[PDB]
Amino acid sequence: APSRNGMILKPHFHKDWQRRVATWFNQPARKIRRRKARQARARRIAPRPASGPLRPIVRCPTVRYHTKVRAGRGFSLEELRVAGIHKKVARTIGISVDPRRRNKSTESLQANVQRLKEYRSKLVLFPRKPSAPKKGDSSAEELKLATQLTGPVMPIRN
């Protein structure tokens, strides 16, 4: 029964909720586990960025977010076509590619081509064998860095 003034309030504890309470005593143990697993994955992908692949710049949807810009899922095909990277290869050099992205405006396209161009400049493709063929960079830019890149690769700053 209500007594003199207060929010006529509806709690949702009518089902058997104590049967499905989910505690968080994991979380520290979890946080570590992720972190180990993270450091392992770095070490496996030895000079490759820990991050992942490079990802496009992309505007959010809706009037609300609109003004901001994130990393997207992957670079469109037009953006790869214009940059001149064969889509099947782009995956092999650490360039995210989605193929479901349309491309409406040319301002978002040329920006994302520029991204890939810049990436290709500051990328150090190792040759397949220690014996060096084409494409593969010099042993100078190799000895001076077989270095991983900490954090997201070429980060987007709005």
């Binding site: 000079p47 500051k122 493709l125 991983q148 070429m154």
Partner: protein, 122 residues
């Protein structure tokens, strides 16, 4: 007095049997003697003879089964006994050669578009 595994390994098959028989006889008499009092001195042996009997029988089965899996090592179909028991499910895994069969389409993919070792910022 002591019958060891050590020596029995080399011995001939007929020779192993006679030895087992002679222990089986010796076991009988002690069992007889346990009924009629006998003596603590006898009622030790009964445990000893039992284990020496086992030591004999064991050597025989090891020899018979070693020879057997020599005889089939090579043949495709072999007795279930001699086939390798791991775990029901584990005997239905894919074959070790069968699970690394690439489709020609997948092989071609690995040939044309291999993942490359690369780094960034230079």
């Amino acid at each position: 007095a002591k019958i060891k595994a050590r020596d029995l390994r080399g011995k001939k098959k007929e020779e192993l049997l006679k030895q087992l028989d002679d222990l089986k006889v010796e076991l009988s008499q002690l069992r007889v003697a346990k009924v009629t009092g006998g003596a603590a001195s006898k009622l030790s042996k009964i445990r000893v003879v039992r284990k020496s009997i086992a030591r004999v029988l064991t050597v025989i089965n090891q020899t018979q089964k070693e020879n057997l899996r020599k005889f089939y090592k090579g043949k495709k179909y072999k007795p279930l006994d001699l086939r390798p028991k791991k775990t029901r499910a584990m005997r239905r895994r894919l074959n070790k050669h069968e699970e690394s069969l690439k489709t020609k389409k997948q092989q071609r993919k690995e040939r044309l578009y291999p993942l490359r070792k690369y780094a960034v910022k230079a």
